[PDB]
Each structure stands twice: as structure tokens, then as C-alpha cells.
């Protein structure tokens, strides 16, 4: 299926991320030392301090996702020993089309892991990438696998989602059922 569903998002923008050279270099804010609202500060601060250790662990195997959250901004990060290196992930406008087939063209028997995308712009000209985690766009089409039977997947395509079946497009979808660990507080 040489066919290509065009896409748009909203304020889940498509970004592309360049590898950061060590232009900028950072670390994390380490544990900070710490009359009914006295007691709330000291727990919160200790929580932040304990939760620090977690952020540490996660920074070592997925730093991009740490820095994106810490700076509320899509960024590509990677470690240089015990320190990080960052760049802004550039945004994408222009049409973002999602090839309908996940079959690999010549190598009839092998497949792609995640849907191929054609998109323009990003300094500049056409690019033949493929759909990364959560609207990363990857410049490279080399997430491959061999074609299973019963391949059903749901990829985050911009604002929405996109269902694929038997390594081939189906529709768009909104994944209706959210699950949450969010703990709201009745006020």
C-alpha cells in the first residue's frame, strides 16, 4: 500500500531531536536540606529528596525524558559520565504523512517496528524518517522486525493515536479508556 494518511496535532507537537554535542551540559538539583504548616514543608522537602533518588536512576537510562520534564520542554539528552548534554528538539510543521504499510519494500518477509513517516521541513527539504516514541520523529528508517502474524499496535500519532493491523494501516483512533495513578485531592 503505497498510500500515506496525512496528519496534524495540536499542543502535542511533533518534534525531531538532533544528537546533542556538549554545547550545554547540566546536572540535577540534588537533595536540599529542610506550626501545622511547618510539618507540611518538612515532609514535602523529604519527599522531593527521596523522589530525587528515583529521578537519578531514570536519568541514567532515559535522560531525554528527565530533561523534558525538568525543563517542561521537548529535549534530546544523553549522559557524559555523571552529567547530561542537551539540545532543544525542533518542532515540525509541514505535512506529516504516515505510510500505510509497515512492510519493508524489497525484503518481503521483514517489516518495520513502527510506522514509516514522510515529512518536510526541519532545516530543510523532505525527510524519510519513522515514528518515534511519543512524537519523536526519527530521521532513520531502521526499526525493523520480521513479520509476525497477529501484529496489532497502537502508536501515538501526534494528538491522537493510530491503529495498525497485520503490519498495515487501519484508521485513526482516540484511545477512550484512560487509566491513572493520578491522586486528586478534594478541595
Amino acid at each position, epitope marked *: 500500500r503505497t498510500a500515506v494518511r496525512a496528519a496534524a496535532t495540536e499542543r502535542d507537537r511533533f518534534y525531531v531531536c538532533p544528537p546533542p554535542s556538549g554545547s550545554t551540559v547540566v546536572r540535577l538539583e540534588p537533595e536540599q536540606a529542610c506550626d501545622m504548616l511547618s510539618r507540611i514543608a518538612a515532609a514535602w522537602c523529604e519527599l522531593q529528596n527521596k523522589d530525587r533518588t528515583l529521578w537519578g536512576e531514570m536519568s541514567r537510562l532515559n535522560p531525554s525524558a528527565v530533561a523534558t520534564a525538568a525543563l517542561g520542554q521537548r529535549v534530546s539528552a544523553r549522559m557524559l559520565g555523571d552529567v547530561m548534554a542537551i539540545s532543544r528538539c525542533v518542532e515540525v510543521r509541514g505535512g506529516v504523512y504516515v505510510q500505510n504499510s509497515m512492510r519493508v519494500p524489497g525484503e518481503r*518477509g521483514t517489516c518495520y517496528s513502527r510506522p514509516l513517516v514522510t515529512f518536510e521541513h526541519n532545516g530543510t527539504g523532505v525527510i524519510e524518517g519513522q515514528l518515534g516514541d511519543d512524537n519523536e520523529l526519527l530521521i532513520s528508517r531502521d526499526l525493523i522486525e*520480521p*513479520c509476525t502474524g497477529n501484529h496489532r499496535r497502537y502508536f501515538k500519532l501526534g494528538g491522537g493515536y493510530v491503529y495498525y493491523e497485520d503490519y498495515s494501516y487501519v484508521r485513526m483512533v482516540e484511545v477512550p479508556e484512560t487509566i491513572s495513578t493520578r491522586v486528586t485531592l478534594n478541595l
Partner: antibody
Amino acid sequence: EVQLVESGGGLVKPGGSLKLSCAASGFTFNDYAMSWVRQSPEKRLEWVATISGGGSYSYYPDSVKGRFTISRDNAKNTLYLQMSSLRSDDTAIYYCTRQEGDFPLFDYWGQGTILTVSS
Amino acid sequence: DIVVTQSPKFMSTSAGDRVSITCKARQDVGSAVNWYQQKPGQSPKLLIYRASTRHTGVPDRFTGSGSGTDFTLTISSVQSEDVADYFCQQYGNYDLTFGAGTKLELKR
């Protein structure tokens, strides 16, 4: 008709080497991914190797990995299988196979390999 | 590997009668199982794919079924030629695997 002949087998000393081959007719060759499937001295059909339609990719069970090399050659529609460190329990019939889009579909004739002793 | 267990080895029926066979994959495959026939002396022959949908050639007494882990071939009214060895494979996962096989048998 989609038809399917293969050859190479015979007797081989353990640790030996042997190349099988497989003549594909009656279908547009590289459109499909080719495979190699082996029936034990009874049953089991072990999947041996599967190569991609173009050539670039191929896949293996850990059992046969390293030892066996699948290859194809689309100039004249022929699929090969290169066995080495050839081992006694590789003794089996070898059916060459055409896959549809995901799995074997027209099984070939059969082609017997054996190991160790003397005629 | 997705070990696929085809019990039983033997399976004995009678002329024109009901038969079926069971394959239990160890993880979910959904619709993605296959059954082949091997009449004595020949190679295998593809019967049913994606579970329960036939190959272009197979008589319509043959019917596969189910999905998930519990897949079962069934043959409506047996004939002479339908005696054979009967093999299931799955294709949700490389490494590719087949069942142990099941042998048919008439009664006359």
C-alpha cells in the same frame, strides 16, 4: 503451477559441511520469502531458516545459528542452505518452503541428510 | 520460545464421522495459527491459516477454530484420503514452532 525442487543431501561425517539448493519455478521469485524446514527421523518439523524476498535479511533458531547460512539468488530463482559444524542430530529430511506473507505455504519435495559411519 | 503442545499423538475415528484436534500455544497468538496435512509418503500441505480460514484448494469438511491459546482443527465427515499426520504451527513469534503432530485412523 508453483513448483519446487531441492537437492544436496546424502551422508556426512560429523563436524562436516554441506550446501543444499532449491530450484523455484512457477511464481515471481523475489515477491516471496523463502524458508527451510526439517523433519526429524519421525516428526517435529524444526524450522531451520527463513530469508527475505530481496536477500537482505534472514532469521534463525538459536539451535542452528552460526552453523547454518541461508542465502538466495534471484537471477535464476534458487535458494541455498549452507550447513557447517554439521552435527549428528541435523540428520533429517529437508523441505525447502515458500512463505505467503508470514509462514510456509507450498512445501517442497523433501531432501534427506544423514551422519557418521559408512556405506 | 512459544512452545506449542499438540496432544494427542494418536486419534482414531470412523468413516464419514466427526473429528477434531487440539493445539495449546503457551502465550497468546490470537488469530495466527496454522494446520498442515501430511499424507503418508508426501511432504506437508498447507490447510488452514490465521486460524479457521482455508487455503485455496482444501475441501470444506475441514474447519479450524478458536484463538488466544486454544486452537482446534475439526473435520466434518471423514473420507479415505483424510487419514494422514496432522501438524499445527504458530506464527506470532520467531522462533517458529510446530506441534508434535497427531495421527489419524479409520475404523473398518
